Coordinates of N, CA and C and ligand atoms in Angstrom, one line a residue:
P4 N 0.1 8.8 -34.7 CA 0.3 10.5 -33.2 C 1.2 9.6 -32.7
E5 N 1.8 10.5 -32.3 CA 3.8 10.4 -31.2 C 3.2 9.5 -29.8
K6 N 2.2 9.5 -29.6 CA 2.2 8.9 -28.3 C 1.6 7.5 -29.0
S7 N 1.2 7.3 -30.0 CA 0.9 5.9 -30.4 C 2.6 5.1 -30.5
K8 N 3.3 6.0 -31.2 CA 4.5 4.9 -31.4 C 5.4 5.0 -30.0
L9 N 5.1 5.2 -28.8 CA 5.5 5.2 -27.8 C 5.1 4.5 -27.2
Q10 N 3.7 3.3 -27.4 CA 2.8 2.4 -27.2 C 3.8 1.4 -27.8
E11 N 4.0 1.2 -29.0 CA 4.9 0.5 -29.9 C 6.1 0.2 -29.1
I12 N 6.8 1.2 -28.8 CA 8.2 0.8 -28.0 C 7.9 0.0 -26.6
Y13 N 6.8 0.2 -26.1 CA 6.3 0.1 -24.1 C 6.0 -1.7 -24.8
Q14 N 5.5 -1.7 -25.7 CA 4.6 -2.8 -26.6 C 5.3 -3.8 -27.0
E15 N 6.7 -3.9 -27.6 CA 7.8 -4.6 -27.8 C 8.9 -5.1 -26.6
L16 N 8.7 -4.2 -25.9 CA 9.5 -4.3 -24.5 C 8.8 -5.5 -23.7
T17 N 7.6 -5.6 -23.6 CA 6.8 -6.4 -23.0 C 7.6 -7.9 -23.7
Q18 N 7.0 -7.8 -25.0 CA 7.3 -8.9 -25.8 C 9.0 -9.4 -25.8
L19 N 9.5 -9.2 -24.8 CA 11.2 -9.6 -24.7 C 11.6 -9.9 -23.5
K31 N 22.8 -18.2 -16.6 CA 22.8 -16.9 -16.5 C 22.2 -15.7 -17.3
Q32 N 20.8 -16.0 -16.7 CA 19.5 -15.4 -17.4 C 19.4 -14.1 -16.4
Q33 N 20.0 -13.8 -15.3 CA 19.6 -12.6 -14.3 C 20.9 -11.7 -15.7
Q34 N 21.4 -12.0 -16.1 CA 22.2 -10.7 -16.8 C 21.4 -10.0 -17.7
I35 N 20.7 -11.1 -18.4 CA 19.7 -10.5 -19.5 C 19.0 -9.4 -18.8
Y36 N 18.1 -9.7 -17.7 CA 17.1 -9.2 -17.3 C 18.1 -7.7 -16.6
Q37 N 19.1 -7.6 -16.2 CA 19.9 -6.6 -15.8 C 20.1 -5.3 -16.7
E38 N 20.7 -6.1 -18.1 CA 21.0 -5.0 -19.6 C 18.9 -4.5 -20.1
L39 N 18.1 -5.2 -19.6 CA 16.9 -5.1 -20.2 C 16.5 -3.9 -19.3
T40 N 16.9 -3.6 -17.7 CA 16.5 -2.6 -16.7 C 17.4 -1.5 -17.5
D41 N 18.3 -1.9 -18.2 CA 19.1 -0.6 -18.5 C 18.6 0.2 -19.5
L42 N 18.4 -0.4 -20.9 CA 17.7 -0.5 -21.7 C 16.4 0.4 -21.7
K43 N 15.4 -0.2 -20.7 CA 14.5 0.4 -20.6 C 14.5 1.8 -19.5
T44 N 15.7 1.8 -18.7 CA 15.6 3.2 -18.1 C 16.9 4.2 -19.2
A45 N 17.4 3.7 -20.1 CA 17.8 4.2 -21.1 C 16.8 5.5 -21.8
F46 N 15.7 4.9 -22.2 CA 14.4 5.6 -22.7 C 14.0 6.5 -21.7
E47 N 13.5 6.1 -20.6 CA 12.3 6.6 -20.1 C 13.5 8.0 -19.9
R48 N 14.7 8.2 -19.8 CA 15.7 8.7 -19.6 C 15.3 10.6 -20.0
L49 N 14.7 9.9 -21.6 CA 14.5 11.1 -23.0 C 13.0 11.7 -22.0
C50 N 12.5 11.3 -21.1 CA 11.0 11.6 -20.7 C 11.2 12.4 -19.4
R51 N 11.4 13.8 -19.6 CA 11.6 14.9 -18.1 C 11.1 15.9 -18.0
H52 N 9.9 16.2 -18.5 CA 8.6 16.8 -18.2 C 7.9 16.7 -17.4
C53 N 8.2 18.0 -16.4 CA 7.8 18.3 -15.3 C 6.4 19.1 -14.8
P54 N 5.6 19.1 -14.2 CA 4.5 20.2 -13.9 C 5.4 21.9 -13.4
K55 N 4.7 22.8 -13.8 CA 5.4 24.1 -13.6 C 5.6 23.7 -12.0
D56 N 6.4 24.6 -11.8 CA 6.4 24.8 -9.8 C 7.3 23.4 -9.0
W57 N 7.2 22.1 -9.9 CA 7.4 21.0 -9.4 C 9.2 20.9 -9.9
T58 N 9.5 20.2 -9.0 CA 11.3 19.8 -9.2 C 11.7 18.4 -9.7
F59 N 12.5 18.4 -10.8 CA 13.3 17.4 -11.2 C 13.9 16.8 -10.8
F60 N 14.1 15.4 -10.3 CA 15.4 15.0 -9.6 C 15.3 13.2 -9.8
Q61 N 16.1 12.8 -11.0 CA 16.4 11.7 -10.9 C 15.7 11.2 -11.7
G62 N 14.4 11.8 -12.8 CA 13.9 11.0 -13.6 C 12.2 11.6 -12.8
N63 N 12.2 12.1 -11.3 CA 10.8 12.1 -11.1 C 10.6 13.6 -11.0
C64 N 9.9 14.2 -10.6 CA 9.0 15.2 -10.3 C 8.3 15.3 -8.8
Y65 N 9.1 16.3 -8.2 CA 8.2 16.3 -6.9 C 7.9 17.9 -6.5
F66 N 7.1 17.6 -5.8 CA 6.0 19.1 -5.3 C 6.5 19.2 -3.9
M67 N 6.6 20.4 -3.4 CA 6.9 21.0 -2.1 C 5.3 21.8 -1.9
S68 N 4.6 21.7 -1.5 CA 3.5 22.4 -1.1 C 3.9 23.5 -0.3
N69 N 3.0 24.5 -0.3 CA 3.2 25.6 0.1 C 2.2 26.1 1.2
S70 N 1.3 25.1 1.9 CA 0.5 24.9 2.7 C 0.7 23.5 3.5
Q71 N -0.1 23.5 4.7 CA 0.0 22.3 5.4 C -1.5 21.8 5.5
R72 N -0.7 20.5 5.9 CA -2.2 19.5 5.9 C -2.3 18.0 6.8
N73 N -3.0 17.7 7.3 CA -3.0 16.5 8.2 C -1.9 15.0 7.2
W74 N -1.6 14.1 8.1 CA -1.5 13.3 6.9 C -2.5 12.7 5.8
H75 N -3.7 12.1 6.2 CA -4.5 11.3 6.1 C -4.5 12.3 4.3
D76 N -5.0 13.9 4.3 CA -5.3 14.7 3.6 C -4.1 15.0 2.4
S77 N -2.8 14.9 3.5 CA -1.7 15.4 2.2 C -1.6 13.8 1.2
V78 N -2.6 13.0 1.9 CA -2.3 11.3 0.7 C -2.9 12.2 -0.5
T79 N -4.0 12.3 -0.2 CA -5.2 13.2 -1.0 C -4.7 13.9 -2.1
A80 N -4.5 14.8 -1.4 CA -3.9 15.8 -2.4 C -2.6 15.6 -3.0
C81 N -2.1 14.2 -3.2 CA -1.2 14.2 -4.1 C -1.7 13.1 -5.1
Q82 N -3.1 12.6 -4.9 CA -3.5 11.3 -5.6 C -4.1 12.2 -6.9
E83 N -4.7 13.5 -5.7 CA -5.6 14.7 -6.7 C -4.7 15.0 -8.1
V84 N -3.4 15.1 -7.9 CA -2.6 16.0 -9.2 C -1.4 14.0 -9.8
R85 N -2.2 13.4 -9.6 CA -1.7 11.9 -10.0 C -0.6 11.5 -9.6
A86 N -0.4 11.9 -8.3 CA 0.9 12.1 -8.0 C 1.2 11.0 -6.4
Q87 N 1.3 10.6 -5.5 CA 2.0 10.3 -4.4 C 2.3 10.4 -3.6
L88 N 2.3 10.8 -2.1 CA 2.8 11.1 -0.8 C 4.1 10.4 -0.8
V89 N 5.4 11.1 -1.1 CA 6.5 10.7 -1.6 C 7.2 9.2 -0.8
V90 N 7.2 8.3 -1.4 CA 7.6 6.6 -1.1 C 9.2 6.8 -1.5
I91 N 10.5 7.1 -0.8 CA 11.6 7.1 -0.6 C 11.8 5.6 -1.1
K92 N 13.1 5.6 -2.4 CA 13.7 4.4 -2.7 C 14.7 4.0 -2.8
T93 N 15.5 5.0 -2.6 CA 17.1 4.9 -2.1 C 17.6 6.1 -1.5
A94 N 19.0 5.7 -1.0 CA 19.6 6.3 0.1 C 19.8 8.1 -0.7
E95 N 20.5 8.0 -1.9 CA 20.6 9.3 -2.7 C 19.3 10.3 -2.5
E96 N 18.1 9.5 -2.6 CA 16.4 10.6 -3.0 C 16.0 10.8 -1.5
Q97 N 16.4 9.9 -0.6 CA 16.3 10.6 0.4 C 17.2 11.5 1.1
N98 N 18.6 11.8 0.6 CA 19.4 12.8 1.5 C 18.6 14.3 0.5
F99 N 18.4 13.9 -0.7 CA 17.5 15.1 -2.3 C 16.4 15.6 -0.7
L100 N 15.9 14.8 -0.2 CA 14.3 15.6 0.1 C 14.7 16.2 1.6
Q101 N 15.8 15.5 2.5 CA 15.8 15.9 3.6 C 16.5 17.1 3.5
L102 N 17.7 17.0 2.5 CA 18.2 18.6 2.6 C 17.3 19.7 1.8
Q103 N 16.4 19.3 1.2 CA 15.0 20.6 0.8 C 14.4 21.6 1.4
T104 N 13.9 20.0 2.5 CA 13.1 19.9 4.0 C 13.9 21.1 4.9
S105 N 15.0 20.4 4.6 CA 15.8 21.3 6.2 C 16.3 22.5 5.6
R106 N 16.5 22.6 4.5 CA 16.9 24.2 3.9 C 15.7 25.1 3.9
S107 N 14.6 24.5 3.9 CA 12.8 25.7 4.4 C 13.0 25.7 5.4
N108 N 13.4 25.1 6.6 CA 12.5 24.6 8.0 C 11.2 24.7 8.2
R109 N 11.0 23.6 6.9 CA 10.2 23.2 7.3 C 9.8 21.5 7.3
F110 N 9.0 21.4 8.4 CA 8.5 19.8 8.4 C 7.4 19.0 7.3
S111 N 7.8 18.4 7.1 CA 7.3 17.7 5.8 C 6.8 16.2 6.1
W112 N 5.6 15.8 5.7 CA 5.0 14.3 5.1 C 6.3 13.6 4.2
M113 N 6.0 12.7 4.5 CA 6.4 11.6 3.6 C 5.2 10.4 3.6
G114 N 5.0 9.4 2.8 CA 4.1 8.5 2.7 C 5.0 7.3 3.5
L115 N 4.9 7.5 4.6 CA 5.4 6.2 5.5 C 4.5 6.2 6.9
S116 N 4.2 5.1 7.4 CA 3.2 5.4 8.6 C 3.3 4.1 8.9
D117 N 2.7 4.1 10.3 CA 2.9 2.5 11.2 C 1.3 2.6 11.6
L118 N 0.5 2.8 10.5 CA -1.0 2.8 11.1 C -1.7 2.1 10.8
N119 N -1.6 1.1 9.9 CA -2.0 -0.4 9.8 C -1.9 -1.3 11.4
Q120 N -0.5 -1.4 11.4 CA 0.1 -2.5 12.5 C 1.3 -1.8 13.6
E121 N 0.9 -0.9 14.5 CA 2.0 -0.2 15.3 C 3.3 -1.0 15.3
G122 N 4.3 -0.3 14.9 CA 5.7 -0.6 14.6 C 6.2 -1.4 14.0
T123 N 5.0 -1.8 12.7 CA 5.8 -2.3 11.6 C 5.7 -1.1 10.6
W124 N 6.4 -0.4 10.6 CA 6.5 0.8 9.2 C 6.5 0.7 7.7
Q125 N 5.3 0.7 6.9 CA 5.0 0.8 5.4 C 5.1 1.9 4.8
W126 N 5.4 1.8 3.3 CA 5.2 3.7 2.8 C 3.4 3.2 2.0
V127 N 3.0 3.8 1.2 CA 1.8 3.8 0.7 C 1.9 3.5 0.1
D128 N 3.0 2.7 -0.5 CA 2.8 1.7 -1.8 C 2.9 0.2 -1.6
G129 N 2.2 0.0 -0.4 CA 2.4 -1.4 0.3 C 3.7 -1.7 0.5
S130 N 5.0 -1.3 0.0 CA 6.3 -1.9 0.4 C 6.6 -1.2 2.0
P131 N 7.6 -2.0 2.6 CA 7.9 -2.0 3.7 C 9.4 -1.3 3.9
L132 N 9.5 -0.8 5.3 CA 10.5 0.2 6.0 C 11.9 -0.7 5.9
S133 N 13.0 -0.9 4.6 CA 14.3 -1.7 4.9 C 15.0 -1.1 6.1
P134 N 15.4 -2.2 6.5 CA 16.6 -2.2 8.1 C 17.6 -0.7 7.5
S135 N 17.7 -0.5 6.3 CA 18.7 0.2 5.6 C 18.6 1.6 6.1
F136 N 17.7 2.0 6.0 CA 16.8 3.4 6.1 C 16.1 3.2 7.8
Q137 N 16.2 3.0 8.2 CA 16.3 2.9 10.1 C 17.1 3.9 10.6
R138 N 18.6 4.1 9.9 CA 19.4 5.4 10.5 C 18.9 6.6 10.3
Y139 N 17.9 6.9 9.1 CA 17.1 7.7 9.0 C 16.5 8.6 10.3
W140 N 15.7 7.9 11.1 CA 15.1 8.0 12.1 C 16.2 9.0 13.2
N141 N 15.4 10.5 13.8 CA 16.2 11.3 14.8 C 16.2 10.4 16.3
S142 N 17.5 11.0 16.5 CA 18.0 10.4 17.8 C 16.5 10.1 18.8
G143 N 16.5 8.9 18.9 CA 14.6 8.3 20.2 C 14.0 8.3 19.6
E144 N 13.8 8.5 18.1 CA 12.9 7.7 16.9 C 12.9 6.5 16.4
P145 N 11.1 5.9 15.8 CA 10.3 6.3 16.4 C 9.8 6.1 18.1
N146 N 9.5 7.4 18.8 CA 9.1 7.0 19.9 C 7.5 6.7 20.5
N147 N 6.8 7.1 19.4 CA 5.3 6.8 19.3 C 4.5 7.4 20.4
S148 N 5.5 8.6 20.5 CA 4.8 9.8 22.0 C 3.9 10.0 21.6
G149 N 2.6 9.3 23.0 CA 1.2 9.8 22.3 C 0.7 9.1 21.4
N150 N 1.3 7.8 20.4 CA 0.5 7.4 19.6 C 0.5 7.9 17.8
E151 N 2.2 8.2 17.5 CA 2.2 9.0 16.7 C 2.4 8.0 15.3
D152 N 1.9 7.7 14.5 CA 1.6 6.9 13.5 C 2.1 7.5 12.2
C153 N 2.8 8.7 11.9 CA 3.6 8.8 10.5 C 4.8 9.4 10.8
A154 N 5.5 9.7 9.5 CA 6.6 9.9 9.4 C 6.5 11.1 8.8
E155 N 7.3 11.9 9.5 CA 7.6 13.2 8.9 C 9.2 13.7 8.6
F156 N 9.3 14.6 7.9 CA 11.3 15.2 7.8 C 11.2 16.3 9.0
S157 N 12.1 16.0 9.8 CA 12.3 16.8 10.9 C 13.7 16.9 11.3
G158 N 13.9 18.1 11.2 CA 15.5 18.2 11.5 C 16.6 17.6 10.1
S159 N 17.7 17.0 10.8 CA 18.3 16.3 9.9 C 17.5 14.9 9.5
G160 N 16.6 14.6 10.1 CA 16.7 13.0 9.8 C 14.9 12.8 10.1
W161 N 14.3 12.0 10.7 CA 12.8 11.7 10.4 C 12.2 11.7 11.9
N162 N 11.1 11.8 12.2 CA 10.2 11.6 13.3 C 9.0 11.8 13.1
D163 N 8.6 10.3 14.1 CA 6.9 9.9 14.0 C 6.1 11.0 14.5
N164 N 4.8 11.0 13.9 CA 3.9 12.2 14.6 C 2.7 11.8 14.9
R165 N 2.0 12.9 15.2 CA 0.4 12.1 14.8 C -0.4 12.5 13.9
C166 N -0.8 11.4 13.3 CA -1.9 11.9 12.1 C -2.4 13.4 11.9
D167 N -3.0 13.5 12.7 CA -4.0 14.9 13.1 C -3.3 16.2 12.6
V168 N -2.0 16.2 12.9 CA -1.0 17.7 13.1 C -1.2 18.0 11.5
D169 N -0.4 18.9 11.4 CA -0.6 19.8 10.1 C 1.0 19.8 9.9
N170 N 1.4 19.6 8.6 CA 2.9 19.7 8.4 C 2.6 20.1 6.1
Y171 N 3.5 20.2 6.3 CA 3.9 20.8 4.7 C 3.7 19.0 4.2
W172 N 3.7 18.9 2.9 CA 3.9 18.0 2.0 C 5.2 17.5 0.9
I173 N 5.2 16.6 0.7 CA 5.9 16.5 -0.6 C 5.4 15.4 -1.5
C174 N 4.9 15.8 -3.0 CA 4.4 14.6 -3.7 C 5.0 14.4 -4.7
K175 N 5.2 12.8 -5.4 CA 6.1 12.1 -6.4 C 5.5 11.9 -7.1
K176 N 5.6 12.1 -8.5 CA 5.3 11.3 -10.0 C 6.3 11.5 -10.6
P177 N 6.6 10.0 -11.9 CA 7.5 10.3 -12.7 C 7.3 11.4 -13.9
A178 N 8.6 12.0 -14.7 CA 8.6 12.6 -15.1 C 7.8 12.2 -16.9
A179 N 7.3 12.8 -17.3 CA 6.6 13.1 -18.7 C 7.2 12.8 -19.7
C180 N 6.8 12.0 -20.8 CA 7.0 12.3 -22.3 C 6.8 13.4 -23.0
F181 N 5.3 13.9 -22.5 CA 4.6 15.2 -23.5 C 4.6 15.9 -22.5
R182 N 4.4 17.5 -22.6 CA 4.3 18.3 -21.8 C 2.0 18.6 -21.8
Ligands
LIG201 C1 4.1 13.6 24.1 C2 4.8 15.1 23.8 O1 4.1 15.7 23.2 N1 5.8 15.1 24.2 C3 6.0 16.8 23.4 C4 7.3 16.5 22.9 O2 7.4 16.1 21.2 C5 7.6 14.8 21.3 O3 8.6 14.6 21.6 C6 9.6 14.7 20.2 C7 10.6 14.3 20.4 C8 8.8 14.0 19.2 O4 9.3 12.4 19.6 C9 7.0 14.0 19.0 O5 7.0 13.4 17.6 C10 6.6 13.5 20.4 O6 5.3 14.2 20.0 C11 7.8 18.0 22.4 O7 9.1 18.1 21.4 C12 9.1 18.3 20.3 O8 8.9 17.6 19.5 C13 8.6 18.3 18.0 C14 7.7 17.3 17.3 O9 6.5 17.3 17.7 C15 10.0 18.1 17.6 O10 10.3 16.5 17.4 C16 10.6 18.8 18.5 O11 12.1 18.5 17.6 C17 10.8 18.3 19.7 O12 11.7 19.5 20.9 C18 7.9 18.6 23.3 C19 8.3 20.3 23.0 O13 7.9 21.2 22.1 O14 6.7 18.8 24.4 C20 6.2 17.7 24.6 O15 7.5 17.1 25.8
CA202 CA1 23.9 -1.8 -19.3
CA203 CA1 -0.6 3.5 16.7
CA204 CA1 3.0 4.3 16.1
CA205 CA1 7.8 11.2 17.5

């Protein structure tokens, strides 16, 4: 079967100035996954991943579960280019949307739903004066041209993300 041979490729990979060897290893792995670009209907393809801009609103927690139900994740932003792309989409659609970011576990400590912390290089995306935790806000949303922390129980459109697949 096809899905079988694919296994054989990832299998061999696992079985494979040192930082220079791994850097090229990442290039190779990426050159292959680059061939897998199938996205579910109505989803957007962007840099190897598929994004879904919901057509309805939900609170933050319900948005998180909505994404898991389609084998995806409330969008966790990894690069500046990704952030700018999403911000433009939400900006043009005039819709406030949730992202997988919150300081729920510990006020002030922003963390993505995949465990990773908010890097200082992303602090520039917050809107002027944010995050102000006005009335205890622990969830991030695309608001205007930047981010804003809002209440978890508020309703917003959301965005989910998952890797493009090799088979339809
Ligand atoms: C405590 C409170 O509810 N204040 C609201 C304002 O919202 C707060 O301040 C803004 C700047 C933002 O930090 C929100 O997260 C706070 O809840 C509210 O301003 C608007 O707030 C929405 C977000 O819900 C957008 O950010 C708009 O751009 C803001 O103008 C104002 C007017 O709606 O009412 C209270 O002061
Ligand atoms: Ca290379
Ligand atoms: Ca809090
Ligand atoms: Ca908070
Ligand atoms: Ca706020």
